[PDB]
Amino acid sequence: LGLNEAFNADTRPTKVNLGVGVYTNEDGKIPLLRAVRDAEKARVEAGLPRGYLPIDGIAAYDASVQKLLLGDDSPLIAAGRVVTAQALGGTGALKIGADFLRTLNPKAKVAISDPSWENHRALFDMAGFEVVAYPYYDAKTNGVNFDGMLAALNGYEPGTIVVLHACCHNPTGVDLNDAQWAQVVEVVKARRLVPFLDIAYQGFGESIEADAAAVRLFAAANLNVFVSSSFSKSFSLYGERVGALSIITDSKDEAARVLSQLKRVIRTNYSNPPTHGGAIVAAVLASPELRASWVQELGEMRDRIRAMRNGLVERLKAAGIERDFSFINAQRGMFSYSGLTSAQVDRLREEFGIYAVSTGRICVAALNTRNLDVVANAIAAVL
């Protein structure tokens, strides 16, 4: 809210907001996705109210989410080992998961990445867990401190909840590769830790299918895996919390038990009907034609971000900056840690009207061909 307020108030014509957390197109606008336009045109032509879903609409959405996570013909889905609770009513899946995990073991510690989105820490701390951080981002290499990460996990007590970004790390853009995911899974299993995967940016990293790899690797490790899906970013629905909580369990018997406890926890805590936005996502993911349209456009969006990462590195070079910025191309999703100091971020803002987070976080999705040079040349001046 605050960086944004200051940017909105800045009277200079060449100002750029890299502090945001949403996708914009080449024109610098928040897109109305074709699938969303088309789901809405269909609802209006049918004469139905906002928020509408057909009789089997919630079930069809839950099924569609499980398929996005695990693949259209997964055996886990077959064995009855996946439970999903919709989060279409403005209570996000992360909150539903935190509340559910707190019923199972309120004394658990929660481990989050160093650094992590403000809301990971706030959510779990507010919920009553002791929150600790595992080593993750390494400012010296612009990569992962993986030795530090595994040593931390290897020291945690059984039942410790480990919150992992499946892909598109917020705020750093630094993701694990598979050698790393495999080793994390092995430690989580050996130490009896509880993995809670946040997948809010599925489709913004490598592909919808590739971005779920961490979920598929955990699901194959014969343990209970908690997954918070969120779709507001991929659907360009600013402020929505639309998503779903999925739990992959180690047996059909464990799924029956988890589902009965989950139902009781949700009935006790909240009954939130689908929002306008939540019903749009449900309608789109339920329809093969609309879904295909979303998949295609999300690809275009993912590819524009990749073009901006490539472009920024090239323009930083062209501006004569001596530092190696190749890490920007290795980072994934909407964000990068630029590596600028807080003083350098102050200068960018004050002298050039380029707004980044004090941590150096920039939103690469806010770049376009009309601001690349403005941004690159300003960074060069500050460095």
From TrEMBL:
PROSITE patterns: AA_TRANSFER_CLASS_1. Its EC number is 2.6.1.-. Gene3D superfamilies: Aspartate Aminotransferase, domain 1 (3.90.1150.10), Type I PLP-dependent aspartate aminotransferase-like (Major domain) (3.40.640.10). The keyword Transmembrane helix does not apply. GO terms for cellular component: cytosol. One of its GO terms (molecular function) is identical protein binding. InterPro entries: Aminotransferase_I/II_large, Asp_trans, NHTrfase_class1_PyrdxlP-BS, PyrdxlP-dep_Trfase, PyrdxlP-dep_Trfase_major, PyrdxlP-dep_Trfase_small. SUPFAM superfamilies: PLP-dependent transferases. Residues 14-379 form the Aminotransferase class I/classII large domain. GO terms for biological process: L-phenylalanine biosynthetic process from chorismate via phenylpyruvate. CDD domains: AAT_like (cd00609). It holds the Pfam family Aminotran_1_2. Keywords: Aminotransferase, Pyridoxal phosphate, Transferase. Its cofactor is pyridoxal 5'-phosphate. NCBIfam families: PRK09257.1 (NF006719). Homodimer. Belongs to the class-I pyridoxal-phosphate-dependent aminotransferase family. This is Aminotransferase. It comes from Burkholderia pseudomallei (strain K96243). The lineage of its organism: Bacteria, Pseudomonadati, Pseudomonadota, Betaproteobacteria, Burkholderiales. The gene is tyrB.
